[model samples]
Target chain A: PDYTSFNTVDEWLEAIKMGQYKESFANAGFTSFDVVSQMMMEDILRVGVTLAGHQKKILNSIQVMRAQMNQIQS
Target chain B: RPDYTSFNTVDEWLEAIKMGQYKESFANAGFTSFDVVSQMMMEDILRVGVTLAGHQKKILNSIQVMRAQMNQIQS
Candidate 1:
């Protein structure tokens, strides 16, 4: 909870890894978008908090999010 | 993680984008109506989707042909 703690992505992600998702650089951090990465998402599943799917359905959701998000830049 | 490794600008973002780091560069698109994507395991699906875009054009063309056929039938 250091005010001047996180200045890099590693620091940011590490904060979240330690269960401090709010410490990241964004305002009112969105936990939904936080799991957009497969790495952390898999970690979320492995830690057994019960989200959904083994790989197929869960990853399919991420891909759909990706495909939808890609349209934003274009 | 290097101090000299600061891609802390839009120009650098554009350079990275040009180099085909679309997803990674999206991450650095700071403070906008944009959400960045990571080059995680979902990358394979991205490639497949990009490839599908080409086929999608072909499908559109086929649909146009189908519409023309319908028009001919109506006549």
Candidate 2:
């Protein structure tokens, strides 16, 4: 299987190269990528994803994840 | 007796706390569902344009009450 599941939000962040937020995101209850994929702007914003670059990277990556996820299921 | 246990939707939550006037504001602010409300913080009320201090405390307080009651029931 090519798929490795994200048991922790930090692991997914590591994959996306945003590993610095591991603790903050985990502390803010973003425990799993399943939950992260469904997030709205305010969730990450509220959790203090303060930088504009980090926001675009995370959200844009999330967008691709969601799109690919949909395609995979289809 | 808080009947907030009976509130099933975001609008219902607002109405239960007697701050139903902010229904549109909350929805427009990306808290379109009760689940999103469960994820809220006190600052979220400010971000949602809940202007009055009394109203802010009421909503945040109600959220805590509802969570505690649900915890009591969920277990």
Candidate 3:
């Protein structure tokens, strides 16, 4: 399934109703498409994403974006 | 047998690859599993502070090797 790639941390957090991670992401510095694309699982968990399904959603979103990104380059 | 023990955590894997600075980046990117690690690319590596071409190559090579090993086990 195709998923929309987020352009900013604010957009992603809002889309998923995970605004709580905002502060932590801010503290880490520089929240953007590339930054989110590179985020590993532990990072989101540390910020309070407990549900596996939710984790998958976020991860899949990144992968979709990664795929789309490659298409543009090719 | 693959030496999978030390690669359990992102920090451990990064440490092994000498890219400790990316520990947080891995965490932030939600890369807890080897599966996720396998999906990483040069662009992602660049975001995590691995700017050197050689280091980037090393990271990608390691990921490719690790992914192959993991796939073998799964198959």
DockQ of each: 0.01, 0.02, 0.02
TM-score for the A chain of candidate 2: 0.81
In CAPRI terms, model 1 is classed as: incorrect
Residue-level lDDT of model 1, residues A1-74, one tens digit each, is: 01112344344344334334333323323234434333345444554425354344435534544554454445
True contacts kept of 2: 0.00
Index of the highest-TM-score prediction: 2
lDDT (Cα, tens digit) per residue for candidate 2, span A9-33: 6656775679988887878887765
Fnat, model 1, is 0.00
Q: Which ten residues in a row are the worst by lDDT in model 1 chain A?
A: A1-10
Task: Judging by lDDT against the true structure, name the best candidate.
Answer: 2
True-vs-predicted CA distance for residue B64, candidate 1, Å: 30
Candidates sorted by TM-score, descending order?
2, 3, 1
Ranking 2 against 3 by lDDT, winner: 2
Better of 2 and 3 by TM-score: 2
Candidate 3 ranges beyond 4 A from true positions: A1-74, B1-7
lDDT of 3 by residue, A1-74 (tens): 11222346775675556666678777776366666656788877765678887788777766655664555466
TM-score of chain B of each: 0.31, 0.77, 0.74
**Model 2 clashing-pair count:** 0
